Amino acid sequence: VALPRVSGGHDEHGHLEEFRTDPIGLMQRVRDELGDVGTFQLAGKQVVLLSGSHANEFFFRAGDDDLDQAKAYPFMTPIFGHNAALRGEQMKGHAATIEDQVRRMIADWGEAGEIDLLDFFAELTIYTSSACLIGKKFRDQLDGRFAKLYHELERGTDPLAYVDPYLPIESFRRRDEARNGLVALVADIMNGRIANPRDMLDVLIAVKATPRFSADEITGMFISMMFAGHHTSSGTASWTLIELMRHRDAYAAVIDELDELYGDGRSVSFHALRQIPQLENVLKETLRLHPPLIILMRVAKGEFEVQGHRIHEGDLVAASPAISNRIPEDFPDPHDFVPARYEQPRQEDLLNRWTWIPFGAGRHRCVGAAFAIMQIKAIFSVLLREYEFEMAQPPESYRNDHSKMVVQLAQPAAVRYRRRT
Ligand code: HEM
Ligand SMILES: CSCC[C@H](NC(=O)[C@H]1CC[C@@H](C)CC1)C(=O)Nc1ccncc1
């Protein structure tokens, strides 16, 4: 018995080509035509796309014995080749680290100027991530080259990886070359440390077996440590700023709140760990509209039924924060930016436990969420108190690029700044 299948997908790799150009439109059509359980074809693989509270509950409550997350991502192998840092006791230090990295990034801004949001936030979040997760010593040996290479690595996630992660296409060539470039950067750092003498890199260097670990092995470890939090935090920062500029009433409310809160004289390392309500509600609404992970994958390990539909062993099964986060029965006026949705009387995030899912839900809910929310609070506590921001292009022209499985803000994303006075 065939599962319901969405229209189209008559191209050579079925729906893959559409998934490479407009994955959100594809997923919305699955739901529009078929409901809570529908399928599309990615080359040789059927994807069973689940949506709505009932089907999402099944998806998110499944453990790795039923729905296996790791086997759904074999294409990350050419890229790769956290808990320690996410302990609550370390958060205060991380907030201070992040404040420091932001001030470093804006140190040359002067009175006024123009930035590109992807270039700015992508680079900044390389610095916050490396400093927090590997160490300040290591971060201080990084520069813009590392960020440029890391970005090429992220761009190595074209959905054609579902055909074969090793095809001779330019983005895969560039992925492999970028990884090579990172190993070289890391090798040069290790070499410098020999000649001129602690962090995680020192622990690893000291291991023996003759050194146990090569630059390639170490680079892989560091790439994997930084990956989950990099493009997600970068994009979320960009979109938080874009939504504030698009909604000047929300922006004004956030500024008033930051000024009042910081009037107690306590640092960002204090406040970024505590309530900043208007900014937090803007962040929640930003995540609902612009979830950086638009689809979540699993491989079925068994036979299941969901609303009469049978999932078979080996099936790819997916959930979509992009689609679920806009279900109109759950989120009134789902295309509208309404941070009031999260205020205490409404609490639409908390009420919709299985469909407000920018950070997932149940068994695999984001363990980086507290860090990521603190990081946004720390970044904007600095930026919005020091500078005022305006769009340098039409407000509707800021958009994501969905050509790779790793979503990124499309360029250009030009923004003006001017010192607040
Ligand atoms: C705004 C930033 C972030 C967003 C939007 C986000 C999103 C998500 C989502 C949707 C899931 C569920 C995945 C699934 O069910 O397949 C998840 C899980 C997870 N995230 Fe994040 N993430 C963010 C930042 C981070 C950071 C900074 C880290 C690490 C420092 C991280 C590490 C993880 C890990 C390890 C899981 C798996 C949890 C488990 O399997 O128990 N994420 N995240
Ligand atoms: C489909 S493009 C790759 C997306 C990427 N996924 C990954 O890095 C992981 C690979 C295998 C793991 C078991 C789980 C997911 C990622 O950035 N995931 C992520 C980010 C933030 N939190 C959780 C997962």
Tab-separated table of C-alpha atoms and ligand atoms in Angstrom:
chain	number	residue	atom	x	y	z
A	1	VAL	CA	0.000	0.000	0.000
A	2	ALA	CA	1.615	3.212	-1.235
A	3	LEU	CA	1.603	6.254	1.062
A	4	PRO	CA	0.082	9.534	-0.211
A	5	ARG	CA	2.532	11.300	-2.536
A	6	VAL	CA	2.709	15.022	-3.285
A	7	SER	CA	2.223	16.330	-6.869
A	8	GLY	CA	5.163	17.116	-9.178
A	9	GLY	CA	8.564	15.480	-8.809
A	10	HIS	CA	8.727	14.455	-12.448
A	11	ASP	CA	12.380	15.578	-12.733
A	12	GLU	CA	15.275	13.092	-12.936
A	13	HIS	CA	15.673	12.805	-9.175
A	14	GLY	CA	11.961	13.126	-8.402
A	15	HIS	CA	11.340	15.998	-5.988
A	16	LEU	CA	15.065	16.536	-5.314
A	17	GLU	CA	15.379	19.411	-7.789
A	18	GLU	CA	12.462	21.246	-6.207
A	19	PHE	CA	13.902	20.483	-2.745
A	20	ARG	CA	17.111	22.184	-3.958
A	21	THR	CA	15.269	25.362	-5.058
A	22	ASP	CA	12.198	25.770	-2.854
A	23	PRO	CA	12.151	23.182	-0.091
A	24	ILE	CA	9.648	25.130	2.035
A	25	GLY	CA	7.159	25.411	-0.861
A	26	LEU	CA	7.562	21.637	-1.462
A	27	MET	CA	6.928	20.815	2.195
A	28	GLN	CA	3.906	23.190	2.397
A	29	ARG	CA	2.449	21.476	-0.668
A	30	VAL	CA	2.828	18.069	0.992
A	31	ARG	CA	0.753	19.357	3.888
A	32	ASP	CA	-1.741	21.292	1.737
A	33	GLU	CA	-2.474	18.300	-0.547
A	34	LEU	CA	-2.124	15.362	1.816
A	35	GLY	CA	-2.412	16.537	5.428
A	36	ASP	CA	-0.425	15.356	8.466
A	37	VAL	CA	1.322	12.462	6.698
A	38	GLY	CA	2.550	12.768	3.106
A	39	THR	CA	5.586	11.833	1.052
A	40	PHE	CA	8.016	13.196	-1.490
A	41	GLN	CA	10.861	11.505	-3.344
A	42	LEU	CA	14.524	12.482	-2.950
A	43	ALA	CA	16.369	10.538	-5.654
A	44	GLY	CA	16.118	6.867	-4.554
A	45	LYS	CA	14.618	7.703	-1.139
A	46	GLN	CA	11.029	8.285	-0.044
A	47	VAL	CA	10.663	10.909	2.702
A	48	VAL	CA	7.612	10.553	4.957
A	49	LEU	CA	6.941	14.165	6.014
A	50	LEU	CA	5.011	14.492	9.277
A	51	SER	CA	3.234	17.711	10.340
A	52	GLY	CA	0.740	18.834	12.968
A	53	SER	CA	0.634	18.151	16.694
A	54	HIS	CA	-0.352	14.466	16.584
A	55	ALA	CA	2.204	13.345	13.991
A	56	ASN	CA	4.934	15.612	15.413
A	57	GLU	CA	4.347	14.087	18.867
A	58	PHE	CA	5.101	10.667	17.387
A	59	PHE	CA	8.230	12.022	15.677
A	60	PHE	CA	9.658	13.804	18.720
A	61	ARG	CA	8.871	11.249	21.357
A	62	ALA	CA	10.578	8.474	19.364
A	63	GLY	CA	13.957	7.359	20.737
A	64	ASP	CA	16.899	6.306	18.535
A	65	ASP	CA	15.712	2.686	18.805
A	66	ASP	CA	12.579	3.618	16.768
A	67	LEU	CA	13.644	6.632	14.693
A	68	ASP	CA	17.407	6.894	14.263
A	69	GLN	CA	18.731	10.389	13.856
A	70	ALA	CA	22.411	9.710	13.186
A	71	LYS	CA	21.926	7.394	10.232
A	72	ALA	CA	19.872	10.087	8.513
A	73	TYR	CA	22.918	12.282	8.065
A	74	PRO	CA	25.580	10.181	6.275
A	75	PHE	CA	26.431	13.238	4.093
A	76	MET	CA	28.039	14.988	7.099
A	77	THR	CA	30.929	12.503	6.930
A	78	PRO	CA	32.988	14.507	4.383
A	79	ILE	CA	32.531	17.627	6.518
A	80	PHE	CA	33.499	16.166	9.907
A	81	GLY	CA	35.931	13.630	8.414
A	82	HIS	CA	29.773	19.743	23.589
A	83	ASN	CA	28.247	19.266	27.023
A	84	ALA	CA	31.358	20.434	28.944
A	85	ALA	CA	30.987	23.971	27.618
A	86	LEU	CA	27.205	24.027	27.941
A	87	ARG	CA	27.145	23.551	31.711
A	88	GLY	CA	25.113	26.256	33.444
A	89	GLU	CA	28.091	27.184	35.642
A	90	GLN	CA	30.059	28.124	32.528
A	91	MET	CA	27.331	30.344	31.090
A	92	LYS	CA	28.337	33.446	32.978
A	93	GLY	CA	31.861	33.209	31.592
A	94	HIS	CA	30.533	32.556	28.090
A	95	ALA	CA	28.332	35.659	28.232
A	96	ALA	CA	31.397	37.704	29.129
A	97	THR	CA	33.318	36.021	26.279
A	98	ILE	CA	30.587	36.796	23.814
A	99	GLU	CA	30.372	40.434	24.932
A	100	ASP	CA	34.134	40.665	24.353
A	101	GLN	CA	33.902	39.168	20.869
A	102	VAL	CA	31.166	41.558	19.825
A	103	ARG	CA	33.091	44.581	21.034
A	104	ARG	CA	36.104	43.300	19.103
A	105	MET	CA	34.026	42.976	15.902
A	106	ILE	CA	32.611	46.514	16.103
A	107	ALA	CA	35.821	48.152	17.326
A	108	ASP	CA	36.464	49.695	13.878
A	109	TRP	CA	32.893	50.740	13.046
A	110	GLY	CA	33.318	54.396	14.042
A	111	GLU	CA	30.431	56.884	13.856
A	112	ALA	CA	28.539	55.345	10.948
A	113	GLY	CA	28.813	52.869	8.110
A	114	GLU	CA	27.317	49.862	6.321
A	115	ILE	CA	27.715	46.114	6.978
A	116	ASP	CA	26.495	42.925	5.269
A	117	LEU	CA	24.637	40.811	7.813
A	118	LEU	CA	25.866	37.433	6.586
A	119	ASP	CA	29.514	38.550	6.463
A	120	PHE	CA	29.201	40.175	9.904
A	121	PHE	CA	27.269	37.505	11.815
A	122	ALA	CA	28.936	34.562	10.130
A	123	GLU	CA	32.333	35.872	11.183
A	124	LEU	CA	31.255	36.945	14.674
A	125	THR	CA	29.761	33.566	15.435
A	126	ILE	CA	32.985	31.805	14.427
A	127	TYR	CA	34.686	33.867	17.110
A	128	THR	CA	32.049	33.345	19.790
A	129	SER	CA	31.839	29.597	19.055
A	130	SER	CA	35.579	28.950	19.003
A	131	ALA	CA	36.251	31.065	22.103
A	132	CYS	CA	33.461	29.541	24.134
A	133	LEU	CA	33.848	25.903	23.024
A	134	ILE	CA	37.594	25.526	22.382
A	135	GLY	CA	39.127	28.456	24.222
A	136	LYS	CA	40.094	32.075	24.023
A	137	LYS	CA	43.718	31.162	23.326
A	138	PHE	CA	42.638	29.196	20.251
A	139	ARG	CA	40.230	31.897	19.087
A	140	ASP	CA	42.952	34.483	19.330
A	141	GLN	CA	44.944	32.561	16.741
A	142	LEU	CA	42.019	32.610	14.333
A	143	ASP	CA	41.205	35.328	11.811
A	144	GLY	CA	38.864	35.953	8.865
A	145	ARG	CA	40.388	33.074	6.850
A	146	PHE	CA	38.943	30.501	9.252
A	147	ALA	CA	35.429	31.950	8.864
A	148	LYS	CA	35.640	32.032	5.069
A	149	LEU	CA	36.743	28.384	4.978
A	150	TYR	CA	34.132	27.283	7.515
A	151	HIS	CA	31.433	28.888	5.344
A	152	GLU	CA	32.583	26.938	2.283
A	153	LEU	CA	32.373	23.813	4.390
A	154	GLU	CA	28.708	24.643	5.242
A	155	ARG	CA	28.015	25.304	1.580
A	156	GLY	CA	29.016	21.649	0.909
A	157	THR	CA	25.530	20.396	1.793
A	158	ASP	CA	23.691	20.442	-1.577
A	159	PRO	CA	20.795	17.912	-1.379
A	160	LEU	CA	22.525	16.038	-4.261
A	161	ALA	CA	24.372	14.406	-1.302
A	162	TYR	CA	21.281	12.159	-1.163
A	163	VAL	CA	22.460	10.821	-4.495
A	164	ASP	CA	26.133	10.675	-3.422
A	165	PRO	CA	28.113	12.988	-1.095
A	166	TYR	CA	31.136	12.479	-3.393
A	167	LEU	CA	29.822	13.622	-6.822
A	168	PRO	CA	32.118	15.776	-9.024
A	169	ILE	CA	30.184	19.005	-8.534
A	170	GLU	CA	31.835	22.292	-7.774
A	171	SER	CA	30.308	22.788	-4.316
A	172	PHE	CA	31.580	19.389	-3.171
A	173	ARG	CA	35.038	20.128	-4.612
A	174	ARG	CA	35.002	23.413	-2.704
A	175	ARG	CA	33.822	21.650	0.454
A	176	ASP	CA	36.762	19.235	0.324
A	177	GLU	CA	39.249	22.012	-0.467
A	178	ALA	CA	37.866	24.164	2.379
A	179	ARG	CA	38.270	21.252	4.830
A	180	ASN	CA	41.864	20.900	3.597
A	181	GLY	CA	42.374	24.630	4.216
A	182	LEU	CA	41.104	24.313	7.770
A	183	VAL	CA	43.437	21.380	8.539
A	184	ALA	CA	46.307	23.557	7.293
A	185	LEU	CA	45.285	26.493	9.508
A	186	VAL	CA	45.157	24.129	12.488
A	187	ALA	CA	48.543	22.593	11.568
A	188	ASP	CA	50.105	26.089	11.491
A	189	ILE	CA	48.648	26.777	14.919
A	190	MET	CA	50.062	23.557	16.380
A	191	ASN	CA	53.418	24.361	14.814
A	192	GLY	CA	53.472	27.849	16.304
A	193	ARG	CA	52.712	26.384	19.708
A	194	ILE	CA	55.769	24.097	19.505
A	195	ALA	CA	58.097	26.981	18.832
A	196	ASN	CA	56.534	29.424	21.255
A	197	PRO	CA	54.895	28.011	24.402
A	198	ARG	CA	46.154	25.740	28.359
A	199	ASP	CA	43.175	24.844	26.221
A	200	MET	CA	41.519	21.972	24.509
A	201	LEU	CA	44.103	22.035	21.712
A	202	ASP	CA	46.902	21.595	24.320
A	203	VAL	CA	45.180	18.578	25.911
A	204	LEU	CA	44.814	16.991	22.486
A	205	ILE	CA	48.397	17.742	21.435
A	206	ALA	CA	49.712	16.104	24.630
A	207	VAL	CA	47.988	12.781	23.945
A	208	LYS	CA	50.329	9.976	22.842
A	209	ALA	CA	50.102	6.443	21.456
A	210	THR	CA	54.448	9.543	19.162
A	211	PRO	CA	51.601	12.108	19.169
A	212	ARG	CA	48.258	10.281	19.111
A	213	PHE	CA	46.425	12.970	17.104
A	214	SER	CA	47.100	14.461	13.655
A	215	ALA	CA	46.066	17.995	12.553
A	216	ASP	CA	43.431	16.318	10.383
A	217	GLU	CA	41.908	14.457	13.393
A	218	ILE	CA	42.004	17.534	15.588
A	219	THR	CA	40.460	19.745	12.907
A	220	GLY	CA	37.633	17.222	12.529
A	221	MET	CA	36.966	17.327	16.231
A	222	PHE	CA	36.845	21.150	16.219
A	223	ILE	CA	34.683	21.301	13.075
A	224	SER	CA	32.170	18.928	14.699
A	225	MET	CA	32.202	20.883	17.995
A	226	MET	CA	31.369	24.193	16.211
A	227	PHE	CA	28.958	22.988	13.549
A	228	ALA	CA	25.568	22.744	15.242
A	229	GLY	CA	25.800	26.190	16.776
A	230	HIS	CA	27.408	28.141	14.005
A	231	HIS	CA	25.052	28.653	11.090
A	232	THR	CA	22.049	28.439	13.385
A	233	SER	CA	23.249	31.255	15.676
A	234	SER	CA	24.576	33.297	12.744
A	235	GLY	CA	21.260	33.176	10.904
A	236	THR	CA	19.182	33.710	14.016
A	237	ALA	CA	21.216	36.847	14.857
A	238	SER	CA	20.748	38.181	11.340
A	239	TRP	CA	17.015	37.553	11.320
A	240	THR	CA	16.531	39.031	14.845
A	241	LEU	CA	18.125	42.241	13.575
A	242	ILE	CA	16.126	42.180	10.341
A	243	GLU	CA	12.833	41.721	12.240
A	244	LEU	CA	13.669	44.525	14.663
A	245	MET	CA	14.334	46.919	11.733
A	246	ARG	CA	11.112	45.795	10.021
A	247	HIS	CA	9.097	46.399	13.186
A	248	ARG	CA	10.264	49.700	14.668
A	249	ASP	CA	7.690	49.512	17.482
A	250	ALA	CA	9.271	46.260	18.713
A	251	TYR	CA	12.763	47.746	18.220
A	252	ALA	CA	11.833	50.812	20.336
A	253	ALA	CA	10.400	48.617	23.071
A	254	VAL	CA	13.608	46.498	23.152
A	255	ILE	CA	15.854	49.590	23.399
A	256	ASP	CA	13.767	51.040	26.223
A	257	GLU	CA	13.955	47.718	28.048
A	258	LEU	CA	17.741	47.318	27.612
A	259	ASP	CA	18.348	50.848	28.844
A	260	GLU	CA	16.161	50.260	31.931
A	261	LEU	CA	17.599	46.856	32.708
A	262	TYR	CA	21.259	47.850	32.431
A	263	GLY	CA	20.524	50.829	34.691
A	264	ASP	CA	21.227	48.539	37.645
A	265	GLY	CA	24.918	48.729	36.693
A	266	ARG	CA	25.344	44.959	36.295
A	267	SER	CA	27.289	43.483	33.372
A	268	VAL	CA	26.103	41.634	30.254
A	269	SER	CA	27.371	38.452	31.983
A	270	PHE	CA	24.642	39.045	34.606
A	271	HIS	CA	21.821	40.220	32.366
A	272	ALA	CA	22.269	37.796	29.489
A	273	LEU	CA	21.454	34.990	31.976
A	274	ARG	CA	18.278	36.666	33.197
A	275	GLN	CA	14.981	37.863	31.757
A	276	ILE	CA	15.057	40.470	28.956
A	277	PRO	CA	11.419	39.955	28.043
A	278	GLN	CA	10.795	42.129	24.981
A	279	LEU	CA	14.035	40.945	23.330
A	280	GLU	CA	13.243	37.337	24.211
A	281	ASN	CA	9.786	37.571	22.638
A	282	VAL	CA	11.260	39.105	19.506
A	283	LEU	CA	13.749	36.186	19.442
A	284	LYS	CA	10.971	33.628	19.893
A	285	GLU	CA	8.954	35.160	17.020
A	286	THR	CA	12.078	35.350	14.840
A	287	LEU	CA	12.745	31.634	15.429
A	288	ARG	CA	9.116	30.758	14.697
A	289	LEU	CA	9.195	32.578	11.327
A	290	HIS	CA	12.815	31.814	10.389
A	291	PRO	CA	13.776	28.479	11.957
A	292	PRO	CA	17.352	27.797	10.835
A	293	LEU	CA	16.693	24.035	10.639
A	294	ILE	CA	13.744	23.774	8.243
A	295	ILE	CA	13.583	19.956	8.139
A	296	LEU	CA	14.673	17.285	10.693
A	297	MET	CA	15.480	13.711	9.496
A	298	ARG	CA	15.353	10.196	10.901
A	299	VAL	CA	15.617	6.650	9.548
A	300	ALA	CA	12.820	4.330	10.692
A	301	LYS	CA	14.216	1.289	12.556
A	302	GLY	CA	10.830	-0.476	12.732
A	303	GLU	CA	7.216	-0.543	11.544
A	304	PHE	CA	4.932	2.212	12.860
A	305	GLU	CA	1.467	3.516	12.070
A	306	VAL	CA	0.589	7.196	12.144
A	307	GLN	CA	-3.017	8.081	11.480
A	308	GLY	CA	-3.637	4.868	9.531
A	309	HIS	CA	-0.443	5.280	7.506
A	310	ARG	CA	2.293	2.690	7.788
A	311	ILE	CA	5.942	3.696	8.111
A	312	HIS	CA	8.359	0.882	7.181
A	313	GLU	CA	11.814	-0.026	8.421
A	314	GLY	CA	14.400	2.004	6.531
A	315	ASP	CA	11.982	4.788	5.580
A	316	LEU	CA	13.264	8.374	5.898
A	317	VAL	CA	10.886	10.223	8.214
A	318	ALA	CA	10.938	14.031	8.595
A	319	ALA	CA	9.390	16.816	10.593
A	320	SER	CA	9.490	20.493	9.535
A	321	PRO	CA	9.833	23.428	11.866
A	322	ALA	CA	9.357	25.701	8.786
A	323	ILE	CA	5.880	24.311	8.173
A	324	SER	CA	4.778	23.374	11.682
A	325	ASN	CA	5.700	26.773	13.094
A	326	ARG	CA	3.115	28.400	10.776
A	327	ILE	CA	0.124	26.044	11.198
A	328	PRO	CA	-2.737	28.566	11.221
A	329	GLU	CA	-4.918	26.740	13.755
A	330	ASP	CA	-2.056	26.848	16.286
A	331	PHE	CA	-0.552	30.267	15.545
A	332	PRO	CA	-3.239	32.859	14.698
A	333	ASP	CA	-2.042	35.000	11.766
A	334	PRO	CA	0.991	32.719	11.288
A	335	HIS	CA	2.783	34.877	8.714
A	336	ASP	CA	2.711	37.933	10.961
A	337	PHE	CA	5.415	39.082	13.335
A	338	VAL	CA	3.673	39.191	16.733
A	339	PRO	CA	6.057	38.951	19.689
A	340	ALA	CA	2.966	39.425	21.953
A	341	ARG	CA	2.205	35.742	21.120
A	342	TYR	CA	4.717	34.784	23.849
A	343	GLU	CA	3.667	37.177	26.578
A	344	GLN	CA	2.409	35.608	29.791
A	345	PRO	CA	-1.275	35.663	28.944
A	346	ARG	CA	-0.830	33.933	25.520
A	347	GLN	CA	2.359	31.824	25.662
A	348	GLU	CA	1.918	30.251	22.209
A	349	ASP	CA	5.335	28.559	22.398
A	350	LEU	CA	4.443	26.734	25.573
A	351	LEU	CA	0.885	25.848	24.598
A	352	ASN	CA	1.897	24.364	21.263
A	353	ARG	CA	4.387	21.838	22.597
A	354	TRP	CA	4.557	19.732	19.434
A	355	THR	CA	4.278	22.439	16.779
A	356	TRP	CA	6.337	25.386	18.090
A	357	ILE	CA	9.537	23.568	17.179
A	358	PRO	CA	12.459	25.839	16.197
A	359	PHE	CA	14.471	23.962	18.845
A	360	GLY	CA	12.757	20.618	18.308
A	361	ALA	CA	10.922	18.829	21.057
A	362	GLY	CA	10.892	15.631	23.172
A	363	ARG	CA	13.891	13.289	23.087
A	364	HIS	CA	16.245	15.303	20.841
A	365	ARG	CA	15.258	18.845	21.926
A	366	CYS	CA	18.139	21.285	21.428
A	367	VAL	CA	20.658	21.044	24.192
A	368	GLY	CA	22.316	24.232	22.855
A	369	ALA	CA	19.122	26.294	23.278
A	370	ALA	CA	20.027	27.979	26.574
A	371	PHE	CA	23.469	28.867	25.170
A	372	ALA	CA	21.968	30.127	21.926
A	373	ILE	CA	19.386	32.324	23.693
A	374	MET	CA	22.041	33.715	26.068
A	375	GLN	CA	24.252	34.422	23.063
A	376	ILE	CA	21.537	36.451	21.321
A	377	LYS	CA	20.851	38.388	24.528
A	378	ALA	CA	24.588	39.119	24.947
A	379	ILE	CA	25.108	40.147	21.332
A	380	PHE	CA	22.145	42.533	21.133
A	381	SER	CA	22.760	43.896	24.646
A	382	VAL	CA	25.976	45.203	23.127
A	383	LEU	CA	24.905	46.080	19.595
A	384	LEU	CA	21.619	47.815	20.340
A	385	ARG	CA	23.058	49.986	23.089
A	386	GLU	CA	26.043	51.117	21.056
A	387	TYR	CA	24.527	51.524	17.558
A	388	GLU	CA	21.262	52.237	15.740
A	389	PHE	CA	20.510	50.116	12.642
A	390	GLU	CA	18.530	50.761	9.441
A	391	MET	CA	17.880	48.667	6.341
A	392	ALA	CA	19.954	49.734	3.274
A	393	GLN	CA	17.738	47.684	0.943
A	394	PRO	CA	14.010	47.061	0.580
A	395	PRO	CA	12.633	45.345	3.680
A	396	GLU	CA	11.167	42.473	1.637
A	397	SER	CA	14.501	41.789	-0.082
A	398	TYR	CA	16.130	40.116	2.907
A	399	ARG	CA	15.729	36.381	2.363
A	400	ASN	CA	17.367	33.023	2.976
A	401	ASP	CA	19.224	30.997	0.406
A	402	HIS	CA	17.748	27.491	0.454
A	403	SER	CA	20.026	25.903	-2.177
A	404	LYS	CA	21.955	23.883	0.433
A	405	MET	CA	20.739	21.770	3.315
A	406	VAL	CA	22.457	24.277	5.614
A	407	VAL	CA	20.311	27.366	5.321
A	408	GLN	CA	22.091	30.711	5.044
A	409	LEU	CA	21.026	34.281	4.669
A	410	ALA	CA	21.236	35.287	1.027
A	411	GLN	CA	23.414	38.189	0.007
A	412	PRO	CA	23.190	41.066	-0.206
A	413	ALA	CA	21.865	41.866	3.255
A	414	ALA	CA	23.099	45.480	3.616
A	415	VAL	CA	22.434	47.395	6.829
A	416	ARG	CA	23.406	50.920	7.928
A	417	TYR	CA	24.603	51.719	11.412
A	418	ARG	CA	25.166	54.926	13.340
A	419	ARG	CA	26.373	55.444	16.899
A	420	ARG	CA	23.588	56.084	19.404
A	421	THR	CA	23.926	59.457	21.183
B	1	HEM	C1	19.442	29.191	17.376
B	1	HEM	C2	20.302	28.162	17.385
B	1	HEM	C3	19.864	26.702	17.313
B	1	HEM	C4	18.743	26.179	16.736
B	1	HEM	C5	17.618	26.966	16.039
B	1	HEM	C6	18.804	24.745	16.979
B	1	HEM	C7	17.865	23.836	16.555
B	1	HEM	C8	17.787	22.526	16.967
B	1	HEM	C9	16.729	21.570	16.609
B	1	HEM	C10	15.512	21.909	15.726
B	1	HEM	C11	17.028	20.408	17.231
B	1	HEM	C12	16.272	19.058	17.187
B	1	HEM	C13	16.920	18.237	16.074
B	1	HEM	C14	16.162	16.980	15.693
B	1	HEM	O1	15.146	16.636	16.350
B	1	HEM	O2	16.585	16.334	14.692
B	1	HEM	C15	18.271	20.578	17.961
B	1	HEM	C16	18.872	19.575	18.688
B	1	HEM	C17	20.185	19.622	19.123
B	1	HEM	N1	21.016	20.721	19.092
B	1	HEM	FE1	20.486	22.630	18.395
B	1	HEM	N2	19.996	24.452	17.632
B	1	HEM	C18	20.656	25.629	17.868
B	1	HEM	C19	21.867	25.778	18.531
B	1	HEM	C20	22.602	24.748	19.011
B	1	HEM	C21	23.913	24.849	19.647
B	1	HEM	C22	24.599	26.177	19.937
B	1	HEM	C23	24.320	23.622	19.965
B	1	HEM	C24	25.629	23.155	20.658
B	1	HEM	C25	26.378	24.029	21.349
B	1	HEM	C26	23.299	22.702	19.503
B	1	HEM	C27	23.351	21.335	19.634
B	1	HEM	C28	22.314	20.451	19.543
B	1	HEM	C29	22.377	19.049	19.882
B	1	HEM	C30	23.567	18.234	20.442
B	1	HEM	C31	20.979	18.502	19.602
B	1	HEM	C32	20.546	17.041	19.796
B	1	HEM	C33	19.952	16.878	21.175
B	1	HEM	C34	19.754	15.393	21.382
B	1	HEM	O3	19.909	14.612	20.386
B	1	HEM	O4	19.447	14.996	22.545
B	1	HEM	N3	22.259	23.425	18.925
B	1	HEM	N4	18.715	21.867	17.774
B	2	LIG	C1	21.020	18.788	6.772
B	2	LIG	S1	22.337	19.962	6.719
B	2	LIG	C2	23.215	19.549	8.205
B	2	LIG	C3	22.558	20.118	9.465
B	2	LIG	C4	23.457	19.851	10.674
B	2	LIG	N1	23.235	18.497	11.209
B	2	LIG	C5	24.214	17.929	11.938
B	2	LIG	O1	25.257	18.500	12.148
B	2	LIG	C6	24.072	16.582	12.604
B	2	LIG	C7	24.648	15.391	11.855
B	2	LIG	C8	24.373	14.090	12.610
B	2	LIG	C9	23.872	14.288	14.040
B	2	LIG	C10	23.548	12.936	14.665
B	2	LIG	C11	22.637	15.192	14.095
B	2	LIG	C12	22.644	16.303	13.048
B	2	LIG	C13	23.215	20.848	11.799
B	2	LIG	O2	23.723	21.960	11.785
B	2	LIG	N2	22.432	20.371	12.775
B	2	LIG	C14	22.034	20.968	13.984
B	2	LIG	C15	22.228	22.307	14.335
B	2	LIG	C16	21.806	22.768	15.598
B	2	LIG	N3	21.255	21.923	16.473
B	2	LIG	C17	21.055	20.638	16.139
B	2	LIG	C18	21.447	20.132	14.901
